[PDB]
Structure 1
Amino acid sequence: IVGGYTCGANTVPYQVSLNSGYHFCGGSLINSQWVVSAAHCYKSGIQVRLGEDNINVVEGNEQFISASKSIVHPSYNSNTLNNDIMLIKLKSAASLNSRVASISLPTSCASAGTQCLISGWGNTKSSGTSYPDVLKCLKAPILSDSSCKSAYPGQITSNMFCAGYLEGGKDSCQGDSGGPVVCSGKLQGIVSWGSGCAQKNKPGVYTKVCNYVSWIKQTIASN
């Protein structure tokens, strides 16, 4: 997260860290045995870390559970990142409490102007890599479809939305991928891509979760 602030330990209880010997993507806990992340974060050997704040120190509240399966959306396209969503089932259910809790899926899509909270342990520099030890937060508004499409002509599908600042300086970045975009207490986006990080006129692009709620429910129900 570039231009964001320290969230404060466990203030984002649905945030998870996907770890393969190091933190590589974020995710959101939606029930005690399932997490939603981005299909481009897929790999084998994933351990899900819940109740995390400082990813390099065990401080208490952490729960490390291995992933039993990862279900990448069948129509995920790695070249356009259309349908960039993935579900991870946990080997055992997490213990939910106030530090580890699930987030609700939306009932309707959000409108431009809605303010949302984006969080993650991704890069904090737009020019160079600087990965933090504690969780960072950023409040960003969803942009209108014309501004999103004028920013990425021909690269936005109806399963994506832009959120951020066209003036630059505040944005999600590499390492934040798979993580949550929460608006009005509902999971509305998944950090997906952008051109560079916090660059002027190049806002972040997020997977539009309201378009996948029936898919998530049917898939969890059959697995």
Structure 2
Amino acid sequence: IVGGYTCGANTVPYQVSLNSGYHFCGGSLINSQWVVSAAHCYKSGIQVRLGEDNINVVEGNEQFISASKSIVHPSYNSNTLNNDIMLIKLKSAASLNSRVASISLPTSCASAGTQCLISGWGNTKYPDVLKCLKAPILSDSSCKSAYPGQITSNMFCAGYLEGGKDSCQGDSGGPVVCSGKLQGIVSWGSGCAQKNKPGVYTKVCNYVSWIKQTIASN
């Protein structure tokens, strides 16, 4: 997260840290046993860390649960990054508090200019404290204006054309929550915080059926 601010301890209860010895990706707790992340963050061994703020110091609110299942979206594309979405099933049921809570799936797709909240432990140019960012949802055409012929259907732009505020490496798989709903997943972009190159996010609105089906199937 570039050009953002320190979130404040446990104000983002759904925000989790994907770990394999060291933080590499972020994620979103959508129910007690399932973390949603990015398909390009996939690896054999994944430990999901919840209730975090400083991931370098044990502060006494963390939950360390390994992943039972790592289900990459069947139609994931490695080049176009189409369907950059992945599901994680925890080894044990996560204990939900006020510091560890779920985030609601898209009730519907969000309007253009919807104020969102992006968060993650990614690069600011990795920090230790969680970084917060408030950015609006850009229109589909403006998203295609920035990325000509690169934007698919399951992608939208959330951020700024002015530059300075964007998601980056390490924030991948992180949440983009707009009005109580997880609308975007940190996917890709041309570097970070560059002008007219905002972050592209996986459109979670189009996967509620897929996500729910996968949960019921596992």
Normalised-by-shorter TM-score class: over 0.9
Structure 1 distance, partners of 2:112, 2:189, is 18
CA-to-partner distance for each residue in 1:23-44, whole Å, 9 max, x for gaps? 0000000011000000000001
SS in 1 for 2:134: strand
SS in 1 for 2:8: coil
Q: Is 1:73 the counterpart of 2:73 in the alignment? A: yes
1:197 — aligned with what? Answer: 192
| Alpha-carbon offset, residue 13 of structure 1 | 0.1
SS in 2 for 1:76: coil
SS in 1 for 2:60: coil
SS in 2 for 1:169: coil
CA-to-partner distance for each residue in 1:63-101, whole Å, 9 max, x for gaps? 000000100000000111000000000000110010000
2:109 — aligned with what? Answer: 109
| Alpha-carbon offset, residue 222 of structure 1 | 0.8
| Alpha-carbon offset, residue 45 of structure 1 | 1.1
RMSD between superposed Cα atoms in Å: 0.5
Stretches (4+) displaced over 2 A: none
SS in 1 for 2:96: coil
| Alpha-carbon offset, residue 107 of structure 1 | 1.4
| Alpha-carbon offset, residue 117 of structure 1 | 0.1
Structure 1 distance, partners of 2:63, 2:171, is 20
CA-to-partner distance for each residue in 1:120-158, whole Å, 9 max, x for gaps? 000001xxxxx1000000000000111100100011000
1:59 — aligned with what? Answer: 59
Structure 2 distance, partners of 1:135, 1:196, is 20
SS in 1 for 2:69: strand
SS in 2 for 1:110: coil
CA-to-partner distance for each residue in 1:158-195, whole Å, 9 max, x for gaps? 00000111010010100000010000011001000010
1:185 — aligned with what? Answer: 180
| Alpha-carbon offset, residue 204 of structure 1 | 0.5
Unaligned runs of at least 5 residues, structure 1: 126-130
What's the TM-score, normalizing by structure 1?
0.97
What's the TM-score, normalizing by structure 2?
0.99
| Alpha-carbon offset, residue 114 of structure 1 | 0.4
1:46 — aligned with what? Answer: 46
SS in 2 for 1:214: helix
SS in 2 for 1:140: coil
Structure 2 distance, partners of 1:208, 1:146, is 15
Structure 2 distance, partners of 1:85, 1:167, is 27
Alignment map for 1:116-135 (pairs within 5 Å): 116-125=116-125, 131-135=126-130
Structure 2 distance, partners of 1:55, 1:103, is 21
Structure 2 distance, partners of 1:80, 1:106, is 23
SS in 1 for 2:61: coil
| Alpha-carbon offset, residue 111 of structure 1 | 1.0
Structure 1 distance, partners of 2:141, 2:75, is 25
Percent sequence identity over matched residues?
100
